Amino acid sequence: LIEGKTKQVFDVPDQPGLLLNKDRITAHDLEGKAAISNQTNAKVFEILKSAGIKTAFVKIASETAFLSKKCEMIPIEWVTRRLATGSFLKRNPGVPEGFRFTPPKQETFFKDPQWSEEQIISAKFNYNGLLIGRDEVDYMRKATILIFEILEKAWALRDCALIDMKIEFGVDTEGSIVLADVIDSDSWRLWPAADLDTVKRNFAWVKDQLDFLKPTIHHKVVVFMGSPADQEHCQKIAKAARELGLDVDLRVTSAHKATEETLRIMQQYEDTHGALVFIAVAGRSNGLGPVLSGNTSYPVINCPPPSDKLVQDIWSSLSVPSGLGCATVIYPDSAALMAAQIIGLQDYLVWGRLRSKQLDMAHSLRQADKKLR
Amino acid sequence: LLIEGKTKQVFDVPDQPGLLLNKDRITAGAHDLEGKAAISNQTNAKVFEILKSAGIKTAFVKIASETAFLSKKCEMIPIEWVTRRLATGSFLKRNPGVPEGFRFTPPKQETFFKDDPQWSEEQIISAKFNYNGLLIGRDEVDYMRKATILIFEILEKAWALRDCALIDMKIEFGVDTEGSIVLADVIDSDSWRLWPSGDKRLMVDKQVYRNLTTVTAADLDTVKRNFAWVKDQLDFLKPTIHHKVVVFMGSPADQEHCQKIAKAARELGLDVDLRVTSAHKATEETLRIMQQYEDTHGALVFIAVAGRSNGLGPVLSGNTSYPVINCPPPSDKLVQDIWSSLSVPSGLGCATVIYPDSAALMAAQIIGLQDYLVWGRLRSKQLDMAHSLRQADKKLR
Amino acid sequence: SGNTSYPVINCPPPSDKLVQDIWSSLSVPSGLGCATVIYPDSAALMAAQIIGLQDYLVWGRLRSKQLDMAHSLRQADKKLR
Amino acid sequence: SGNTSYPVINCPPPSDKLVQDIWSSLSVPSGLGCATVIYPDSAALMAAQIIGLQDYLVWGRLRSKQLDMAHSLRQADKKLR
């Protein structure tokens, strides 16, 4: 159990591994908002789950409650700001409101005075067998900044500047740090009893935006292979790109053996109003890529399959004739990433998953470093 | 002086060596009167500004009044150049069995003679047309076919911003004093077939008028309101999209190379920043500069320029989620040094290019996914390059 | 190539060293018309293309092969699509 | 080469980058008879050796050219000997 003026958290003994019940209060006044918070939070956590962020959140249990992974909370409020405003200004006299933080500032607070990262470490917190050290702190700093960045991106679709946020972490049963609280309209600062109605009218305003926060942008990445032998390699690009959330087509065509038909296949893709990326996969002398780049205005990325001859063959991909923007990459994972980075310019979720992937790789290195050290 | 038409008059303008087109308030699908010369003129002018902004060569100079515009004087080729994306209209009559809405990829393009019977490219060639010293051969016909498709593709993309499906078009070409072929006459709501939401029922073009056997003044009103709407929607078709291309050079010595990138990309309509920083000698500040660029909601492309062992490009890539392009400066050692750009550690999406013009194109190709006008210029440049080759070929042939 | 007037095509066999050795085939002394090819199938095709200038039937078979290869790509495209 | 049945000879222009670029000429996809030569004179000779299968006079000039070259070598030798 845990009591919190705006929420109660109960054990659920029939399900091994929590029920959170949101209350209709504001911290002190009341409203008709507990359903809204639950609705807001569930929406937020789902977006972060789709970005790949690890959360305690499992699913909605009711209109005012949700089911969560059971875990012991680290008594730190993790705060991120893009601008100087609010209580920040008092603590830092001389900084004008609207002072922009690049990268976003991230500060920590105890259960409510400010602590340094040094303080959190020297505090020697211990939850579920996980002592919170600088690695743990590093991960939470990076994760808080990332979460802020994802949501900042989302609200920008609805013409709202996200100004700052506070979140909280906990340690699940298996020693894993999960994002573990409630993120609603009290957790953030968003810009573009009578007074309480206009406050309700605000949570109602946020309730309206929630369905517009995860929109479907349409895009296709098409992989042309010059030969069916390049099959496994292309499937590796596809798998990588699909995991990043891309819609991928695999096609076979030769710029040498089926020149006119190759041009006709890409023109069929050019009848779209969504985003389009071509990946060119051609062993030996790659004319596939350069011919596409010469006949279309959409980005073309060269990804030769693995080969002994790639050391000689790669110059057919590079060193295109002048006036062609064909770019070249050498590994299939990196081809998917390039495509995703391009499409991520229009789809914050792909862009989210890319940043999350970086966090994953970095945290994995530390796991490995701890093992060889 | 004068040149006469149903919907327009073209008078000479004697003080300005170079024509005025005066639009008439008539509608000739049979033939009636309206207040629509001003609507047509304004519709046209907005269309020509967009095509000029894409790089298309036009006779159009500027608006002269509310119903007239100034045009470069040129002799017209008596061909209507028609492009379709979908099957509808008279195409259905000429090709029985092909259902309405049959999709043409690439867009279908047909030609019609001024007499309106259909001609083949052969017929146009064998006609041996000659205007301002330019005899129209297969090369000139190729150019007009390619440009017609290009012009339809640009407008198709533009109308898609206001949720309208452009279904087909008609344009006309002329030859200027200098022997150059320019897109001429007029493009307005009589020139095309427009469907909102891709809905045939909501059509806004002169087809509404063409379908009437009997014609009331009410019917004419609905035509004016449809054309007025189109004129109004055109104002939202050239919007300012936000994007930034940043070139990071590892040394100020790489200065000319980066400027070549900047120059190319600016010609394509991109906003470029040139910055100096080392991923070796100033690691933390390199990261700091890219986080400053990451405070945007616009598009962002990083181009990394690094001689010798390029750690710059791969370091940016490992630290950002925006696309990063490697464009090493020219060098004898590039044959050896290039593998520092290629062959990044697993999990990096850094892509590689070797020529400065070609980095700017990659950047533009990425940005054009969000800016149809930039996308327009890339296609327009491909057209310029192909027409240049034929001229070069004609000289060495 | 130095002692005959008939076309001579070089087709080195496959080898790790072909990357170094191929320049012994290319880069002939001035006044030699030796041409170089790298795969056995492609050498037979060069020979065929040369002889097809006199034998329309060989020339036919070359064109038929191109049609075959293009038609086969579509079979493959239809399977991975 | 992929679109015609007549012989196609590759002759890239001189360039420092030829050591790298030449593999775009060699190493064509399977089923192409594209052949490669590295010098402009040797390209004309390949064409000539092909056309000479049908034009004995062209074929004659190729052998005469070989004779001129051998005889020129001896005059050169006699001068340095």
Q: Please report, for the domain that includes residue B330, its CATH number.
A: 3.40.50.1970
Buried b (16+ CB within 10 A) or exposed e, A27-42: eeeebebbbbbbbbbb
- Distance from the Cα of B114 to chain A's closest Cα (Å) equals 31
Gap between the Cα atoms of A249 and A238, Å rounded:
8
My answer on whether B167 and B285 are in the same domain is no
| Residue A171 near residue A76 (C-beta atoms within 8 A) | no
Query: Is residue A254 less than 8 Å (CB to CB) from chain C?
Result: yes
Residue with tokens 């890239």: D12
Mutation test of the interface with chain A: which of D8, D24, D34, D36, choosing the one with the most A Cβ atoms within 10 A? D24
Angle at CA A78, nearest 5°, toward A73 and A84? 160
Gap between the Cα atoms of A341 and D28, Å rounded:
32
Would you say the C-alpha torsion A183, A187, A188, A189 has a positive or negative sign?
positive
Q: How far is CA A8 from the centre of its chain?
A: 29
My answer on whether B153 and B288 are in the same domain is no
Q: Which domain holds residue B274?
A: 242-369
Interfacial C residues in 46-75 facing A (CB < 8 Å): 66, 69-70, 73-74
- Comparing CA positions, the residue from B309, B243, B295, B251 lying closest to residue B275 is B251
DSSP C19: H
Gap between the Cα atoms of A1 and A103, Å rounded:
37
Q: Which residues of D touch A285 (CB under 8 A)?
A: 23-29
Gap between the Cα atoms of B358 and B367, Å rounded:
14
Structure tokens at A1: 């159990």
Q: Do D24 and A227 touch (CB under 8 A)?
A: no
My answer on whether B222 and B128 are in the same domain is yes
Q: Do B349 and A327 touch (CB under 8 A)?
A: no
Nearest CA in chain A to D28: A285
User: Which residue in the set B321, B353, B379 is minimally distant from A351, CB to CB?
Assistant: B321
My answer on whether B375 and B360 are in the same domain is no
Gap between the Cα atoms of C73 and A227, Å rounded:
8
The length of chain D in residues reads 81
Gap between the Cα atoms of A244 and A242, Å rounded:
5
Query: Is residue D22 less than 8 Å (CB to CB) from chain C?
Result: yes
Residue B296: count other Cβ atoms within 10 Å of its Cβ.
14
Gap between the Cα atoms of B73 and B78, Å rounded:
16
Q: Which residues of B touch A153 (CB under 8 A)?
A: 297
Q: Do A251 and C80 touch (CB under 8 A)?
A: yes
Query: Is residue A276 less than 8 Å (CB to CB) from chain B?
Result: yes
Residue B161 to residues A50, A273, B156, B235, Cα–Cα distance (Å): 29, 10, 9, 11
Q: Do A284 and D25 touch (CB under 8 A)?
A: no
- Comparing CA positions, the residue from B66, B48, B49, B64 lying closest to residue B11 is B64
Query: Is residue A268 less than 8 Å (CB to CB) from chain B?
Result: yes
Structure tokens at B91: 């195409």
Angle at CA A28, nearest 5°, toward A27 and A30? 90
Residue with tokens 């391009």: A342
Structure tokens at A369: 């470093």
- Comparing CA positions, the residue from A177, A160, A146 lying closest to residue A213 is A160
My answer on whether A173 and A232 are in the same domain is no
| Residue B229 near residue B208 (C-beta atoms within 8 A) | no
φ, ψ at B301 (rounded to 5°): -125, 130
Q: How many CA atoms lie within 13 A of A71 on its CB side?
A: 28
Residues 6+ apart with CB under 8 A from B223: B27, B34, B206, B208, B209
Secondary structure, 3-state, chain B: CCCECCCEEEECCCCCCCCEEEECCEECCCCEECCCHHHHHHHHHHHHHHHHHHCCCECEEEECCCCEEEECCEEEEEEEEEEEEECCCHHHHHCCCCCCCCEEEEEEEEEEECCCCEECHHHHHHCCCEECCEECCHHHHHHHHHHHHHHHHHHHHHHHHHCEEEEEEEEEEEEECCCCEEEECCCCCCCEEEEECCCHHHCCCCHHHHHCCCCCHHHHHHHHHHHHHHHHHHHHCCCCCCEEEEEEECCHHHHHHHHHHHHHHHHCCCCEEEEECCCCCCHHHHHHHHHHHCCCCCEEEEEEECCCCCCHHHHHHHHCCCCEEECCCCCCCHHHHHHHCCCCCCCCCCEECCCHHHHHHHHHHHHCCCCHHHHHHHHHHHHHHHHHHHHHHHHHC
Mutation test of the interface with chain A: which of D23, D25, D26, D34, choosing the one with the most A Cβ atoms within 10 A? D23
Angle at CA A171, nearest 5°, toward A167 and A174? 145
Residues 6+ apart with CB under 8 A from D67: none
My answer on whether A57 and A45 are in the same domain is yes
Three-state secondary structure call for residue A106? strand
Q: Do A319 and D17 touch (CB under 8 A)?
A: yes
Chains near B, with 3+ CB pairs < 8 A? A
Q: Which residues of C touch A253 (CB under 8 A)?
A: 73, 77
Chains near D, with 3+ CB pairs < 8 A? A, C
| Residue B358 near residue A300 (C-beta atoms within 8 A) | no
User: Which residue in the set B318, B346, B361 is minimally distant from A325, CB to CB?
Assistant: B361
Q: Do A253 and C19 touch (CB under 8 A)?
A: no
Structure tokens at B153: 């593709």
- Beta-strand relationship, B134-135 and B164-176: unpaired
My answer on whether B139 and B237 are in the same domain is yes
Find residue B275's DSSP bridge partners: B248
Structure tokens at A76: 């730190």
Gap between the Cα atoms of A130 and A124, Å rounded:
10
My answer on whether B73 and B222 are in the same domain is yes
Q: Which residues of B touch A338 (CB under 8 A)?
A: 323, 349-351
Gap between the Cα atoms of B101 and A259, Å rounded:
28
Q: Is C37 left (phi over 0), alpha (psi -120 to 50) or beta?
A: beta
The length of chain C in residues reads 81
Residue-wise DSSP of A47-89: HHHHHT--BSEEEE-SSSEEEE--EEEPSEEEEEEEE--THHH
Reported resolution, Å: 2.8
Structure tokens at A210: 């929630």
H or E stretch covering C41 = helix C40-51
User: Which residue in the set C5, C32, C59 is minimally distant from D42, CB to CB?
Assistant: C32
My answer on whether A87 and A171 are in the same domain is yes
User: Which residue in the set A252, A257, A261 is minimally distant from C66, CB to CB?
Assistant: A257
User: Which residue in the set A267, A295, A299 is minimally distant from B105, CB to CB?
Assistant: A267
Q: Do A319 and D25 touch (CB under 8 A)?
A: no
Find residue B354's DSSP bridge partners: none
- Comparing CA positions, the residue from A249, D2, A356, A271 lying closest to residue B102 is A271
Residues 6+ apart with CB under 8 A from C15: C21
Gap between the Cα atoms of C68 and C52, Å rounded:
18
User: Which residue in the set D1, D23, D32 is minimally distant from A313, CB to CB?
Assistant: D23
Gap between the Cα atoms of A320 and A300, Å rounded:
12
Q: How far is CA B55 from the centre of its chain?
A: 7
What stretches of chain A show up as alpha helix (H) in DSSP? 34-51, 87-91, 117-122, 134-155, 194-209, 231-243, 259-269, 288-295, 310-313, 332-343, 348-372
- Comparing CA positions, the residue from A249, B117, A251 lying closest to residue C73 is A251
With touching defined as 3 or more inter-chain CB pairs under 8 Å, the answer for chains A and C is yes
Q: Do C66 and A228 touch (CB under 8 A)?
A: no
Q: How far is CA B378 from the centre of its chain?
A: 8
Gap between the Cα atoms of B219 and B222, Å rounded:
5
Q: How many CA atoms lie within 13 A of D39 on its CB side?
A: 14
Gap between the Cα atoms of A256 and A226, Å rounded:
9
Residue with tokens 């002939």: C28
My answer on whether A13 and A116 are in the same domain is yes
Gap between the Cα atoms of A69 and A58, Å rounded:
7
Query: Is residue B170 less than 8 Å (CB to CB) from chain A?
Result: no
With touching defined as 3 or more inter-chain CB pairs under 8 Å, the answer for chains B and C is no
Gap between the Cα atoms of C65 and B48, Å rounded:
49
My answer on whether A49 and A141 are in the same domain is yes
Query: Is residue A227 less than 8 Å (CB to CB) from chain D?
Result: yes
> Which residue numbers come right before each break in chain A (C to N over 2.5 Å)?
17, 27, 111, 192
- Comparing CA positions, the residue from D18, A271, A137, A225 lying closest to residue B156 is A271
Q: Which residues of D touch C7 (CB under 8 A)?
A: 46, 49-50, 53
With touching defined as 3 or more inter-chain CB pairs under 8 Å, the answer for chains D and C is yes
Q: How far is CA D16 from the centre of its chain?
A: 20
Q: Which residues of A touch D15 (CB under 8 A)?
A: none
Find residue A29's DSSP bridge partners: A26
Query: Is residue C41 less than 8 Å (CB to CB) from chain A?
Result: no
- Distance from the Cα of A336 to chain B's closest Cα (Å) equals 8
- Comparing CA positions, the residue from B321, B307, B315 lying closest to residue B258 is B307
Query: Is residue D15 less than 8 Å (CB to CB) from chain A?
Result: no
Query: Is residue A284 less than 8 Å (CB to CB) from chain D?
Result: yes
Q: Do A319 and D21 touch (CB under 8 A)?
A: yes
DSSP A230: G
Gap between the Cα atoms of B221 and B360, Å rounded:
49
My answer on whether A333 and A351 are in the same domain is no
Structure tokens at B161: 């911003």
Query: Is residue B323 less than 8 Å (CB to CB) from chain A?
Result: yes
- Distance from the Cα of A247 to chain D's closest Cα (Å) equals 29
| Residue C70 near residue D32 (C-beta atoms within 8 A) | no
Sheet of A188-191, strand order? A114-115, A100-110, A76-83, A161-167, A188-191
Find residue B84's DSSP bridge partners: B108, B168
Three-state secondary structure call for residue A19? strand
Gap between the Cα atoms of C74 and A252, Å rounded:
8
Nearest CA in chain C to A248: C81
H or E stretch covering A222 = strand A219-225
Q: Do A254 and D27 touch (CB under 8 A)?
A: no
> Which residue numbers come right before each break in chain D (C to N over 2.5 Å)?
none
Q: Do C81 and A250 touch (CB under 8 A)?
A: yes
Query: Is residue D20 less than 8 Å (CB to CB) from chain A?
Result: yes
| Residue B170 near residue B162 (C-beta atoms within 8 A) | no
The length of chain B in residues reads 397
Q: How many domains is chain A partitioned into structurally?
A: 2
User: Which residue in the set D27, D28, D41 is minimally distant from C31, CB to CB?
Assistant: D41
Q: Do C46 and D54 touch (CB under 8 A)?
A: no
Structure tokens at B280: 């070796």
φ, ψ at A26 (rounded to 5°): -130, 125
DSSP A286: -
Gap between the Cα atoms of C42 and C34, Å rounded:
15
